[PDB]
Design a protein around this nucleic acid. Structure first.
Lengths: 153, 394, 60
RNA sequence: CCAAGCGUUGGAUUGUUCACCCACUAAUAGGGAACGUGAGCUGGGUUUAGACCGUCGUGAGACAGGUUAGUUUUACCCUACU
RNA sequence: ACCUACUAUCCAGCGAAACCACAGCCAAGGGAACGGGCUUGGCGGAAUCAGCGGGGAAAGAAGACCCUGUUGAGCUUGACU
RNA sequence: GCCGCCGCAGGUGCAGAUCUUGGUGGUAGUAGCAAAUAUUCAAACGAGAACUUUGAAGGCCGAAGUGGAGAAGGGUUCCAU
RNA sequence: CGUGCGAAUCGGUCGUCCGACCUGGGUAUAGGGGCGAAAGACUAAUCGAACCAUCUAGUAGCUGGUUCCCUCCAAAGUUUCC
RNA sequence: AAAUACCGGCACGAGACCGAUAGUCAACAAGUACCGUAAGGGAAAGUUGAAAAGAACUUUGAAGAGAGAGUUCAAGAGGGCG
């Protein structure tokens, strides 16, 4: 299918895509904007050290009441967190992207993640019980993802 | 409609921005006013809160019922290693205030003082004042320098000095020595600056700033206490036991209309660690440190004239949560701000002091050393052995 | 690897509480294909699955 | 007269607003703030449904005539203040 | 005053509601006579974590009190049939 | 699959009705997963062990039982792959 | 607790406890009707007249709403009788 | 006996009608899913393409999810798909 952008030139550049992923849309969108301006082997590294709490993700848009921490000044900010399932997901996705560079015949060490986007997806309903005999909803907020990498020394 | 019976109110409405102080060392907000009549001296100094104990004295004040009788008054112990100047600093008089004019430093600045310029001494090449000193022994840095000492000699009117403490000599964990401006009050700025230079790199002891039975003022930071409630912070009435959502409160915030809520009214929030300036604390004795001579070491600080035993102010088991006190000290009547181990800026008074409770000369008859860590009964270790006999260890 | 079952048929031959049964750890492979009462009546004879002795309440 | 800088309290009977008495005191001046103030409290009074009298009506019923018992909901949004 | 238990607080995983013209710093003035928006003055410096319960004539229910309606029902007798 | 001109015909034009039906926001990654004491160390199955399985420790129910079996009612939820 | 665990619970303290005691099954009483040691109580979360369908789109001097443009003229709250 | 009546039944033929929130409650396993002890109450829900030609082989992954091959005029028609 198509991606929110092309690749600038198709010969030097690889894709990967994620349909209906059971993660939080927002936590994902926030971790997918730190990752953005980094090399692959800075990225892989930065997403083990989120998982192991030595480097936080900045909560910039979606910061309703979100805490404050010591590893966020690093991002000149004050709010931030350590979303672990969001990482363990888009640390799968890489493996696929990485795994399409050699099946063209390209340099896996020069692949600069250009494109990476995060979209809302169809909600999954389940239900939950509140006083005076009533029933609210209790719904799921999944997502799709995409990304596009490109070779540069 | 009105308040049925009256009261007074809850707390002081000058002191009210009850925030955690911007600085950890007490700032001197205001030194005295000089008169060119009297000779040069420093004003301020630096100690550390190390303790508290009794005294006993025989009092003279004719009139009262404690005349020639023997009270006990309480005291604090402030430990004062003699301070080390490293520079001077000039200020000029203006119509927007008091602009700081020119600054200079000594050739040799210690490493507890090269520790005061860094956030991290572990990784840093210790390169502060490396290119600077250089000037002090080349023939093109004796002239530029004394161009400028001859510029303060004209333009500047206020003159100050700068002194680093000595944390090689205290029993604390830390090693970062405090730099602190101090005003030099005295003769015309010519003299004021003949004296300063001459003292770069020297030591200045507490014998020289302060004297016995003086009235000093005591500046520092409070013992801190946490985000605390309205009942602890402001000292209101509790509420009565029937109340649906709590009784350590104010029950009426404000009226209906001037429909805001006013900075006058009492609220939750941070309790303590403010800055603060108490006054008129007396000086009952200036101590002497542990000087060695002729083999033996001499350690009679606490030796009053009325019991001459061998003891120093140090108590059995040491002072608690602090250390042992070797370095020369001052003995303040009354209590002072801050925890133990916390740094206590001194000062003369602004206010020229004549009453009777000022001019009261003091000599003592007892100084306490019975261990404070427990509930003590013994004044000195040897005296114990003599009371108790030999134990199952001997 | 999984013996809610072999612990059941045990406690129905030893005529006791499942509490009292003892299923030798080491030989968890020899006891987790048994799976039918005869093949447990063996392993009781053999000394893998054993009864524990009754907890003392001293009347002393 | 200038002066509202600083205060103007503890108890008995009463649901009190009001009243009156004891005692201490420099003095126990008066008022506003939606008759300041219930998502601050208390519900003791009035002002639902049960019950009893004391006047009125043949009666269902009625009382500024008195009585007993009667469930006080929400804050996570903006501001304000800390 | 101080202590203990559980929350509150901070982190991973899961994750609902009521409510919402547009919104949200004050004086006084007029005005359907008690303005967040108008007029005259004072002023206005990203984004936010914990609390509080002054203000939104806060939310919650087409006032249960009173009056009207040529709208009713439960009770009672000398109202009429 | 559709439109202009002359004439006919009507279930013919929305901002609103605490209007009908369907879909989506701000609030918000916030309120919150707090009643009846309590767990920890080793192994073995596995792509994944704070929670499942075995073995060892420390605990609770304490025969008016968190034990053993029935009647109404449920209707296969029983048992192994 | 009061957007609860509960459309009436839970906790400590409480009333009775060999007698007009306290409970299971089978049975009789049906809506101006039943049953009531009598509060207008109870009659399947409903009671000073239960629930389901129809007559029915019941009637309203009273609330709320009432869909395209330009052009021209533009009022009334006063008089008798209800 | 006839000339009259016929929103139930068995077959038929038309329409200046409505076109999937319309038109019957019902274009489809509807008087069906489900609710009420029972009388009774009662929905939502049409569309790949001309043809299944419904994507062999390779490759990352434990798996869903992917990268390239390929059918079609098109997957910018990929099994709830104009």
């Amino acid at each position: 299918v198509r991606y929110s952008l092309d690749p600038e030139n198709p010969t030097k550049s690889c894709k990967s895509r994620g349909s209906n992923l059971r993660v939080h849309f927002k936590n994902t969108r926030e971790t997918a904007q730190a990752i953005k301006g980094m090399h692959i082997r800075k990225a892989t590294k930065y997403l083990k050290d989120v998982t192991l709490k030595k480097q936080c993700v900045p909560f910039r848009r979606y910061n309703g009441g979100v805490g404050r921490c010591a590893q966020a000044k690093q991002w000149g900010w004050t709010q931030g967190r350590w979303p672990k399932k969001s990482a363990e997901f888009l640390l799968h996705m890489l493996k696929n992207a990485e795994s399409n560079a050699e099946l063209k015949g390209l340099d896996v060490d020069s692949l600069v993640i250009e494109h990476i986007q995060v979209n809302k997806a169809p909600k999954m309903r389940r239900r939950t019980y509140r006083a005076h005999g009533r029933i609210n909803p209790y719904m799921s907020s999944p997502c799709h993802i995409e990304m596009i990498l490109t070779e540069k020394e | 409609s009105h308040r049925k019976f009256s009261a007074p109110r809850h707390g002081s409405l000058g002191f009210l921005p009850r925030k955690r102080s911007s600085r950890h060392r007490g700032k001197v907000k205001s030194f005295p006013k000089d008169d060119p009549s009297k000779p040069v001296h420093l004003t301020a100094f630096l100690g550390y809160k190390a303790g508290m104990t009794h005294i006993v004295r025989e009092v003279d004040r004719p009139g009262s019922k404690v005349n020639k009788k023997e009270v006990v008054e309480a005291v604090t112990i402030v430990e004062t290693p003699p301070m080390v100047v490293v520079g001077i600093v000039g200020y000029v008089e203006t119509p927007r205030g008091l602009r700081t004019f020119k600054t200079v430093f000594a050739e040799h600045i210690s490493d507890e003082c090269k520790r005061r310029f860094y956030k991290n001494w572990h990784k840093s090449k210790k390169k502060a004042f490396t290119k600077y000193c250089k000037k002090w022994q080349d023939d093109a840095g004796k002239r530029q320098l004394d161009k400028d000492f001859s510029s303060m000699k004209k333009y500047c009117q206020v003159i100050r000095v700068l002194a680093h403490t000595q944390m090689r000599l205290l029993p604390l964990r830390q090693k970062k020595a405090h730099l602190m401006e101090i005003q030099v009050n005295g003769g015309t700025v010519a003299e004021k600056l003949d004296w300063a230079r001459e003292r770069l790199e020297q030591q200045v002891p507490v014998s020289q700033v302060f004297g016995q039975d003086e009235m000093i003022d005591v500046i520092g930071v409070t013992k801190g206490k946490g985000y605390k409630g309205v009942t602890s912070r402001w000292h209101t009435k509790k509420l009565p036991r029937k109340t649906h959502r709590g009784l350590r409160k104010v029950a009426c915030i404000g009226a209906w209309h001037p429909a805001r809520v006013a900075f006058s009214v009492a609220r939750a929030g941070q309790k303590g660690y403010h800055h603060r300036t108490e006054i008129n604390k007396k000086i009952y004795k200036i101590g002497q440190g542990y000087l060695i001579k002729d083999g033996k070491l001499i350690k009679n600080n606490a030796s009053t004239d009325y019991d001459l035993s061998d003891k120093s102010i140090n108590p059995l088991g040491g002072f608690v949560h602090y250390g042992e006190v070797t370095n020369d000290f001052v003995m303040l009547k009354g209590c002072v701000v801050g925890t133990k181990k916390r740094v206590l800026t001194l000062r003369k008074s602004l206010l020229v002091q004549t009453k009777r409770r000022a001019l009261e000369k003091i000599d003592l008859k007892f100084i306490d050393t019975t261990s404070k860590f427990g509930h003590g009964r013994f004044q000195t270790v040897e005296e114990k052995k003599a009371f108790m006999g030999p134990l199952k260890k001997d | 690897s999984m013996l809610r079952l072999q612990k059941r048929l045990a406690s129905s031959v030893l005529r006791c509480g499942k509490k009292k049964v003892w299923l030798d750890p080491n030989e968890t492979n020899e006891i987790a294909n048994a799976n039918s009462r005869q093949q447990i009546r063996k392993l009781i004879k053999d000394g893998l699955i054993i009864r524990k002795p009754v907890t003392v309440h001293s009347r002393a």
